[PDB]
Write a protein that binds this ligand. Structure first.
Ligand SMILES: NC(=O)c1ccc[n+]([C@@H]2O[C@H](COP(=O)([O-])OP(=O)(O)OC[C@H]3O[C@@H](n4cnc5c(N)ncnc54)[C@H](OP(=O)(O)O)[C@@H]3O)[C@@H](O)[C@H]2O)c1
Ligand SMILES: C[C@@H](C(=O)O)c1cccc(Oc2ccccc2)c1
Ligand SMILES: C[C@@H](C(=O)O)c1cccc(Oc2ccccc2)c1
Ligand SMILES: C[C@@H](C(=O)O)c1cccc(Oc2ccccc2)c1
Ligand SMILES: C[C@@H](C(=O)O)c1cccc(Oc2ccccc2)c1
Length: 343
């Protein structure tokens, strides 16, 4: 329980993470209320939308300064009396809540997830795993022999959309930007990995899947979204999970050729369905429970990229978050990008 700590703070609204966010060095350690845990963060998750958050896009009325980081895993170092009925000092806990980019974060006990130990694999589940699980269960209409296309398939959430679709006996196609990532996809049971830098995705889908794909787990936006719509089967479902190709722009939007979208959907009786995890929190506990079971049992690969093969090596310390965000946006990661705060 130190007097002071470091944390990241959004000091200016911008999708340029380095220009928006400051490493603040002499911050008091916040104290937990009656219903709160104080978590010493050991690993924190880097998420594409960290730059949407720094840009102010979740609530454009809220001015800087504000905390940042959506998820953490670590040890309970202090807690309020009511919280102590369910949690104990020293316990491993994980959470999805704002302000994880800090050495210590106050988290309401009611939203914390107990975990068996502090491993970065368990953090991969909190946002990336639950997003894939809930969207596909609630909106995917998966069943044996459906064809599922997953974009950013070798990324944090993509790896789960791939594996969970396979567990539903689907035939799965996955896009990624390298042969190393394609090999990773194959190792997860991907039926058709596509390196979109060396193989034209539109041609692959037209030639190999002429009747189309039944479900798209679409994270990329832009030209990839356009191709995905064209590739939809009759009654197919494209799920808008995100559009990372656009987040760095002033609006966060990626250009699409969507003027003909209503016509295309009518012609195919097909759909475009958005998904925002925070609209489905009633499903979160059950998703996390099943994901954790599969993770511990070794029935789910939870790939972690701690940056050990990045230019400057392992993502250690809050200062490495800047590098880690850049790494994501250079498309370099395989699995979930995680930063370690060692102690
Ligand atoms: N709807 C929700 O509630 C929700 C929740 C969590 C995440 N998401 C979304 O899921 C997506 C993935 O997020 P993540 O945090 O798991 O990241 P991630 O997939 O681990 O990393 C992003 C990957 O996207 C590709 N990429 C990066 N920059 C790109 C660009 N400029 N243009 C095109 N492709 C680019 C790269 O893979 P390739 O090798 O394939 O290029 C990169 O590895 C994002 O759209 C995010 O907003 C949505
Ligand atoms: C797209 C929009 C907003 C947030 C995103 O990424 C999220 C969104 C919500 C919770 C976790 C991650 C992805
Ligand atoms: C119980 C069964 C089932 O509900 O089909 C199952 C087994 C293994 C992983 C699952 O997780 C998911 C979750 C979403 C989509 C596909 C599979 C779901
Ligand atoms: C068409 C596509 C993308 C952006 C557009 O126009 C705007 C203009 C300002 C903010 C957001 C979108 C209009
Ligand atoms: C009970 C659990 C724990 O203490 O975290 C455990 C015990 C032994 C080996 C494990 O191996 C792993 C490690 C990472 C993810 C899944 C399984 C995980």
């Amino acid at each position: 329980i130190p007097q002071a700590m470091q944390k990241l703070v959004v000091t200016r609204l911008s999708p340029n993470f380095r220009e928006a966010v400051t490493l603040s060095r002499d911050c008091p350690v916040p104290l937990p209320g009656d219903g709160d845990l104080l978590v010493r963060n050991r690993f924190v998750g880097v998420n594409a939308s960290d730059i949407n958050y720094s840009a102010g896009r979740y609530d454009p009325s809220v001015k800087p300064p504000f905390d940042i980081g959506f998820e953490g895993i670590g040890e309970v170092v202090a807690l309020g009396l009511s919280a102590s009925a369910r949690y104990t000092v020293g316990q491993a806990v994980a959470y999805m809540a704002p302000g994880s980019f800090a050495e210590y974060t106050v988290v309401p006990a009611s939203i914390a997830t107990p975990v068996p130990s502090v491993k970065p694999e368990y953090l991969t589940l909190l946002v990336s795993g639950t997003t894939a699980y809930i969207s596909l269960k609630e909106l995917g209409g998966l069943s044996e022999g459906k064809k599922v296309l997953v974009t950013a398939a070798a990324g944090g959430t993509g790896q789960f959309a791939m594996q969970l679709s396979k567990k539903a006996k689907c035939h799965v196609i996955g896009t990624c930007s390298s042969d190393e990532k394609s090999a990773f996809l194959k190792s997860l049971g991907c039926d058709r990995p596509i390196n979109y830098k060396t193989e034209p995705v539109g041609t692959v889908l037209k030639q190999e899947y002429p009747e189309g794909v039944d479900v798209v787990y679409e994270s990329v936006g832009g030209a990839m979204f356009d191709l995905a719509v064209d590739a939809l089967a009759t009654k197919g479902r494209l799920i808008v999970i995100g559009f990372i190709s656009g987040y760095q722009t002033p609006t966060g939007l990626s250009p699409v050729k969507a003027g003909t979208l209503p016509a295309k959907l009518l012609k195919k009786s097909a759909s475009v369905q958005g998904f925002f995890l925070n609209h489905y929190l009633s499903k979160y506990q059950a998703a996390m429970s099943h994901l954790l079971e599969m993770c511990v049992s070794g029935d789910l690969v939870c790939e972690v990229d701690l940056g050990d093969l990045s230019p400057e090596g392992r993502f250690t310390g809050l200062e490495s978050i800047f590098r880690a965000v850049n790494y994501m946006y250079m498309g370099k990661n395989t699995g979930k990008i995680v930063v370690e705060l060692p102690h």
